[model samples]
Target: DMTRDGLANKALAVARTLADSPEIRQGLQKKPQESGIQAIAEAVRKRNDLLFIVVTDMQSLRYSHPEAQRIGQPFKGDDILKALNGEENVAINRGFLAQALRVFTPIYDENHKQIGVVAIGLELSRVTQQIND
Candidate 1:
């Protein structure tokens, strides 16, 4: 049986993998290139466990989301500020629609400057369901 801690660790791996992708890095570094960033995020979110993927600048302004209306707004979580400071973290928190277990990491540019943050969240119920399976 997979424990919640195990799932959170896996979530961080997913976040790290996405953050380390050169293609994703380029897309994020490009900033306002909506289609590019959203493309990568969309592909990443196809995993059933990944309920949502959000891309935000260091200032905490969102650039990508599963819901179009959520883009271009301030990211809505206390974790945003920590991630912007280059912290890679995973936690359970209430998100836009429900309580979720989420992982977050920093997005770096060619010069290795932390320019943005990317996060992936899985609804808590989804984790429990997987455990019960």
Candidate 2:
């Protein structure tokens, strides 16, 4: 099996949800800090099965993440960075440790410039935990 960057329907759903939600977009504008992220995550948590999450810019500047380490960090991963740049659609993984999925949806400003991206998704453990917890 392609153990790296495996694909999942969950990721696709995240992309679609973020792509279509105006409230989320507006909220992100007013708040990109922890509360904003928490709100989005909680809302998404209610609305979907989510695990690891991120909201960033086309530049891949980390705007929000449930994982604090990544919250303020720049996207150092090539796969996600490329997708943010519009170089790819989505990336599951590069090699092993591929039990995760990423969903990307571009964020647009009033002028409609692709300003950022919202990525909310789940990894393997999170999915299992979410189901049983």
Candidate 3:
């Protein structure tokens, strides 16, 4: 679980830093850190078990996803949107990498409105590797 926690913490650190990036300033017109995909397949170079790390806006703009190929996509489906909007923790076994888990948390500004979310996913295999160590 240390590896999983480390990965999650690392992503939040990245997001916190990226929140004040040029992309956010120039592109999103918001803090770049507001978007995150640090744990996705695209940015992470490691075990094949890596799945996806993502963040989305309240509107479900593919703010970021582990797979760059899927970036900018929309996950506005009723259920997915529900998962994002809902106030709860969600986990599911997807496949081999399906062994991984995805998490979403509401993102709020200082005023405390739920504006978006930060999501991080990791293959249980990766966590298992860390545990076996």
Q: Candidate 1 residues 1-133, lDDT tens each?
A: 4587888777777777777777666665565445377767777788645788888877877767877777777888896677989998777786575789888999888788997888888888988888896
Q: Is candidate 1 or candidate 2 better by TM-score?
A: 1
Worst 10 residues of 1 by lDDT: 26-35
CA lDDT of each candidate?
0.77, 0.56, 0.49
Which pairs of residues collide in model 1? Answer: none
Q: Write one digit per residue (lDDT tens) for candidate 2, span 1-133.
A: 2332333455666665665556646655653454355456556755665554566766676665555555555754556655566433564442122355556667676776666676645565654454554
Which of 2 and 3 is ahead in TM-score? 2
Residue 127 lDDT in candidate 3: 68
Off by over 4 Å in 3: 1-51, 76-83, 86-90, 95-98
* Residue-wise C-alpha lDDT for candidate 3, range 66-127, written one tens digit per residue: 44555566643233454456453445455213455555555555465555555545676766
For the record, the alpha-carbon RMSD of candidate 1 to the native fold, in angstroms, is 2.1
Residue pairs with backbone overlap in model 2: 5-92, 5-93
- From the highest TM-score down, the ranking of the candidates is 1, 2, 3
Tell me the lDDT of candidate 1: 0.77
TM-score of each: 0.85, 0.63, 0.53
